Amino acid sequence: FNPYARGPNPTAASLEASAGPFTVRSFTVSRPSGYGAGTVYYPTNAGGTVGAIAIVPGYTARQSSIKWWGPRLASHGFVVITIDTNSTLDQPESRSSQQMAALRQVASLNGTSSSPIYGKVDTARMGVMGWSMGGGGSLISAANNPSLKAAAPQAPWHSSTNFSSVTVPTLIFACENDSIAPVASSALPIYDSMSQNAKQFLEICGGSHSCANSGNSNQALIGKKGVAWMKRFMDNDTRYSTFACENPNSTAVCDFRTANCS
């Protein structure tokens, strides 16, 4: 028996749906501690403590760019914080620090009797996501904090592609037609650098740099993969092993790679 398993046995249809099995509520963080602002999404009815995921936007961008992940993930049994950075022009290292400050504050709110997430969080089970420089920051977070259970950045950018130190299970979303952080010089080299981990590469056909953002036309596939990855690795939930590891057989997938996935 897996003490972290939540929710019904998954299906393709249940993971491609706009909403998971749990009812979601949200709040604005009242006093953001070490980052600009944040929104916490949480399930009201998960039936046990859940892991936490912190999601960071790209350069110039705000929560709106990554907000669709909050309800999508929380509805499957996660506490999700979407942040604004101290500056829209923060670089990846700063974004990583702020992402981890957001996870810290979620852990603090677990212990805060006034918070809607009082006693809802397993602080030992955490995940990192983000777009562009926030995706680079997620990879920095993973490199610096190997106790993180999963990473799933989208269209990442970092001034270095070498993440050979990362031992955290890492899914990279990439966008075929990205001209900001081209796949061939950013996402794919970042993927190829990682030698120690479970990892996956999923490139979306015809995608611009914003192909995994709020308002994308591939929420069925991208949401299925992001939830499956986080369930598999944050919850050690092998019910999700096939959904996490499979080549999905979608018209939307223009490049796929996976390694050390079980």
Q: Report, as residue numbers or ranges, the catalytic residues.
A: 132, 178, 209
C-alpha closest to that of 137 among 35, 256, 41: 35
Give the angle 60-61-64 at the CA atoms, nearest 5°. Answer: 160
Q: How far is CA 232 from the centre of its chain?
A: 13
Are the C-beta atoms of residues 214 and 66 closer than 8 Å to each other? yes
Give the angle 104-136-168 at the CA atoms, nearest 5°. Answer: 65
Give the angle 48-7-149 at the CA atoms, nearest 5°. Answer: 70
**To the nearest whole angstrom, how small is the minimum distance from the Cβ of residue 10 to ligand NAG?**
18
**To the nearest whole angstrom, how small is the minimum distance from the Cβ of residue 49 to ligand NAG?**
6
Residue, CB closest to ligand NAG: 119
Q: Provide the β-strand partners of residue 126.
A: 52
Beta carbon nearer to ligand NAG, 214 or 245: 245
Specify burial of residue 201 (Cβ count, 10 A radius: 0-12, 13-18, 19+). buried
Cα end-to-end distance, the chain, whole Å? 18
Amino acid letter, 173: F
Structure-token pair, residue 226: 């992001």
Residue 131, annotated as binding a ligand: no
Residue 59, annotated as binding a ligand: yes
**To the nearest whole angstrom, how small is the minimum distance from the Cβ of residue 209 to ligand NAG?**
23
Binding site for ligand NAG (CB under 6 A): 34-35, 49, 86, 94, 97-98, 110, 119, 121-124, 162, 164, 193, 249
Q: Is the dihedral of CA 219, 224, 229, 230 positive or negative?
A: positive
**To the nearest whole angstrom, how small is the minimum distance from the Cβ of residue 26 to ligand NAG?**
19
**To the nearest whole angstrom, how small is the minimum distance from the Cβ of residue 262 to ligand NAG?**
21
Residue 133, annotated as binding a ligand: yes
Task: Compute the 3-state secondary structure of the chain and give helix, strand, coil in percent, each to the nearest 5.
Answer: 30, 20, 50
| Residues tagged in the binding site annotation for poly(ethylene terephthalate) | 59, 133, 157
